[PDB]
Design a protein around this ligand. Structure first.
Ligand SMILES: Cc1cc2nc3c(=O)[nH]c(=O)nc-3n(C[C@H](O)[C@H](O)[C@H](O)COP(=O)(O)OP(=O)(O)OC[C@H]3O[C@@H](n4cnc5c(N)ncnc54)[C@H](O)[C@@H]3O)c2cc1C
Length: 527
């Protein structure tokens, strides 16, 4: 019944459910909590993340939800929201059609949950993974339901999206490396009448510091929901268990500073600022994604972005393995591609925290990359792609504006029109393998047909030409070939995650094209 089991119904588990169900993989997700967290948690989704979400129709509703928060421009430090304001303060179009999406996680997760359900994912909230075993043929997961009933779920694979203290990662005996836990926090979600203390003021984030509380205060778009994130110090013997119902009510009222405002405490969750990355992201039939694979310091919000990109990398790979169109070795490329990105991103998170806290060395400032380089400029060191002979390999990340279709990088964004309606290369990706060819590459259609039939895998062919007739994509400024680093007779094979798999810079005469594409796609698919 269930081919992939997902543990965790937070951002990465739900992203995995959407991407898997998009690729028509039967999915069961278990989440111990009775629904999605109301905590805002990570709030910034970079353009690359938005492009990923675009492929499953989540970017549009997420942008709609984000416009509600767009007036929240002011960052402030205050004694309390009602009291003294200490301080306050407030072009990618050639690279990406997406902008930074400023939407709290508690608003993105319902959109993902809704889309996974639409696509036919089975989501079980109030369901706890107790333990699992795996064998040559599959995974057997003990799940305890909301009624305390147990049952054993049999899946082909298990994706562990079960967060930083992942009992799955620990049960596999996967260790982690990195600088470790930097500070311990509690996120306190509450309802309150914010409008009565804000008046016309709208904040992105408020730093609260008075004698009774220090922490970070946020209010939602409706002005009815907030979150106070406070530190505790274990070397004073303080712990999560000190954050009682009464203690949470005291901290929030101290942060608001009014007492006429009625506060309803919803829930408290622990959260650590940490730099910890799993030594391996794949163990036989278990894949580890998101916070379970990498705890990333929050400065820059790279963690949430990195986890959605993990879900996107692994989901089509499971689909092809489960379809028998790929060898099981294709799953190991999830580890190959994503672990180095995870470890690099965790270190970039640590640099950003150092720079932000004004404790960075000049070397740390020199090492710190733009968020666009960190999230859109990746070149995987190796994995499910064929590198260009002779080509100087790329470093793990570059200025994404400098990328020109190198295998292991994001297939570049080129603006197209189809029947006068705007399109881009990115719209062609996300469903299946795609072969793009230049104006002089009409013969690559037959090569795509030959490769597709040989390997029993779909290949969508699009010649990209600056005239193109009815129903075909027009390259309206003739930039496709230069952007994809090929000649007008060349072709580029793009994976279902929009990463370049292979290219031919030049034409290939007769059946040579078909033979070369079949060989390349056979390597990519571990066959
Ligand atoms: C309170 C809080 C505040 C945060 N604030 C920030 C922030 O300000 N900035 C930032 O960048 N990131 C922040 N994060 C982290 C961010 O939310 C994560 O990076 C993001 O959600 C991706 O993590 P994930 O989905 O892989 O795992 P998580 O979000 O950790 O979710 C894991 C899920 O697995 C579930 N689970 C665990 N064990 C089991 C089990 N045995 N059976 C079933 N379900 C299980 C958990 O209940 C949970 O819903 C915060 C996280 C928390 C919890």
């Amino acid at each position: 019944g269930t081919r992939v089991l997902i543990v965790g119904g937070s951002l990465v588990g739900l992203s995995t459910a959407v991407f898997l169900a998009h690729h028509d993989v039967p999915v069961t997700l278990v989440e111990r909590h009775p629904g999605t967290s109301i905590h805002p948690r990570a709030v910034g989704y970079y353009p690359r993340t938005a492009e990923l979400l675009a492929t499953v129709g989540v970017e549009a509703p997420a942008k709609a939800a984000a416009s509600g928060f767009e007036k929240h421009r002011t960052r402030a430090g205050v004694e309390s929201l009602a009291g003294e304001v200490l301080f306050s303060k407030e072009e990618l179009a050639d690279l990406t059609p997406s902008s930074l999406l400023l939407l709290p996680q508690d608003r993105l997760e319902p959109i993902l949950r809704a889309r996974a359900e639409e696509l036919g994912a089975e989501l079980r909230f109030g369901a706890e993974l107790r333990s699992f075993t795996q064998d040559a043929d599959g995974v057997s997961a003990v799940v305890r339901d909301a009624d305390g009933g147990e049952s054993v779920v049999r899946a082909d694979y298990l994706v562990a999206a079960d967060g930083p203290r992942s009992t799955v990662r620990e049960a596999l005996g996967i260790g982690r490396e990195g600088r470790g836990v930097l500070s311990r926090h509690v996120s306190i979600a509450f309802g309150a009448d914010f409008a009565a203390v804000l008046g016309e003021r709208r904040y992105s984030v408020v730093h609260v510091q008075n004698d009774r509380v220090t922490g970070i205060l946020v209010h939602d778009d409706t002005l009815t929901e907030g979150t106070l994130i406070v530190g505790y110090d274990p070397e004073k013997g303080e712990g999560l268990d000190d954050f009682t119902d009464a203690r949470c009510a005291e901290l929030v009222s101290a942060a608001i500073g009014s007492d006429d405002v009625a506060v309803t405490i919803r829930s408290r969750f622990p959260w650590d600022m940490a730099e910890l990355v799993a030594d391996a992201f794949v163990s036989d039939r278990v894949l580890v994604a998101g916070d379970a694979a990498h705890q990333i310091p929050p400065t820059g919000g790279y963690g949430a972005n990195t986890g959605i990109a993990d879900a996107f990398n692994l989901s089509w790979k499971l689909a092809h393995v489960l379809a028998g169109t790929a060898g099981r070795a294709l799953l190991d490329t999830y580890d190959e591609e994503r672990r180095p990105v995870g470890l690099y991103t965790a270190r970039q998170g640590s640099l950003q925290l150092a720079v932000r806290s004004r404790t960075a060395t000049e070397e740390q400032r020199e090492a710190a990359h733009d968020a666009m380089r960190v999230t859109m400029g990746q070149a995987y060191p190796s994995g499910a792609f064929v590198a260009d002979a002779g080509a100087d390999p790329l470093p793990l990340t570059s200025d994404p504006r400098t990328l020109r279709g190198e295998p292991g990088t994001r297939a570049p964004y080129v603006v197209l029109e189809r029947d006068g309606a705007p399109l881009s290369t990115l719209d062609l990706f996300g469903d299946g393998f795609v072969l793009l060819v230049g104006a002089d590459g009409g013969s690559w259609a037959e090569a795509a047909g030959e490769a597709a039939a040989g390997l029993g895998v779909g290949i969508a062919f699009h010649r990209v030409a600056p005239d193109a007739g009815e129903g075909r994509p027009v390259d309206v400024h003739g930039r496709w070939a230069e952007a994809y680093g090929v000649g007008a007779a060349g072709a580029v094979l793009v994976r279902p995650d929009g990463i370049v798999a292979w290219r031919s810079r030049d034409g290939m005469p007769g059946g040579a094209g078909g033979r070369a594409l079949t060989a390349a796609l056979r390597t990519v698919l571990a066959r």
